[PDB]
Design a protein around this nucleic acid. Sequence first.
DNA 1: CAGCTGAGTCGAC
DNA 2: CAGCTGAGTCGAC
DNA 3: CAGCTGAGTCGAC
Length: 164
Amino acid sequence: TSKLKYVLQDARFFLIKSNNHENVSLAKAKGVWSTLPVNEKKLNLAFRSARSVILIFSVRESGKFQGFARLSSESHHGGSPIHWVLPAGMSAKMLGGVFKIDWICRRELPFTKSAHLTNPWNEHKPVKIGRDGQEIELECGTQLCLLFPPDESIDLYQVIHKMR
DNA sequence: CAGCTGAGTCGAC
DNA sequence: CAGCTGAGTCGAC
DNA sequence: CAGCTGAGTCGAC
């Protein structure tokens, strides 16, 4: 995992929570993500200050993580629309900011396999606990990403090249 | 974003 | 007007 | 396939 550990060096980690499976599947297919404006501003500021910003995805009530990815841009408004399945009470403009993301792993990891990992930045609660945008301490987030099964469909050349 | 809440005075120093 | 924020899991019942 | 069943809330954290 030396290439994987390289991508994770000095990274900041954020839990991303989706209300539906459809938007995570579209995120994996198109390499983009959108979030509410508060978390959008948080991720934009993290992108500018951190070597890498890693998003760890978990569909609400699914009992698993669905993979993780690296932010490759700040959010962009006004591009070609992403046709998200809009959660209840949310409009398309609320998710108007579109981040480009490079997926590092698109495989699943059940919460049962992460039960030994606690986040010291969230009162040492298990890493499965949190709302959208919950930040995860460096070492806890690194170990979590290393728990995912290997994704043979991922080529880390491009993400590593744009980090040089 | 978009719907929501709340918007002190008075006196010592 | 400025300030705030929702796309948490889990046990009890 | 194709006929069938079932579609928790609330509060601590």
